[PDB]
Amino acid sequence: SMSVKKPKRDDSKDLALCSMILTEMETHEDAWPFLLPVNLKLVPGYKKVIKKPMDFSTIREKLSSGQYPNLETFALDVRLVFDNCETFNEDDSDIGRAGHNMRKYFEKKWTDTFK
């Protein structure tokens, strides 16, 4: 509350560390469904169904241009990529499996880096 603060957690390395995690996600072999925005002209249903599209290239541009106010807003966009994937893809498809694998990979890195 006013003039009463919890001790200051050091956040000065968060930008660099999120960039590293994102680089590791970009270079995973199962990243291919997630590298670029889904083409909304060429993929029937996507525009109407997925209210907030997200992809790694878009997260990379947001990161580089100071559009994440803190590390939680970064993790929300990453998770949004996987949540969108589950919404639109069967679990037993190549893309559906890719998304489960990438989410698992992301969450471990996140815990190991910050928790």
Q: How many CA atoms lie within 13 A of 113 on its CB side?
A: 20
Give the domain ranges of the chain: 1-115
How large is the greatest C-alpha to C-alpha distance in the chain, in angstroms?
A: 55
3-state secondary structure 54-89: CCHHHHHHHHHCCCCCCHHHHHHHHHHHHHHHHHHC
- How far apart, in whole angstroms, are the C-alpha atoms of residue 15 and residue 18? 5
List phi, psi (to 5°) of 55.
-155, 165
Give CA separation, 108 vs 11, 21, 25, 92, 105, in Å: 20, 10, 12, 23, 6
Q: Which CATH number is correct for 1-115, 3.30.413.10, 3.40.50.12780, 1.20.920.10, 1.10.10.410?
A: 1.20.920.10
Report resolution in angstroms. Answer: 1.9
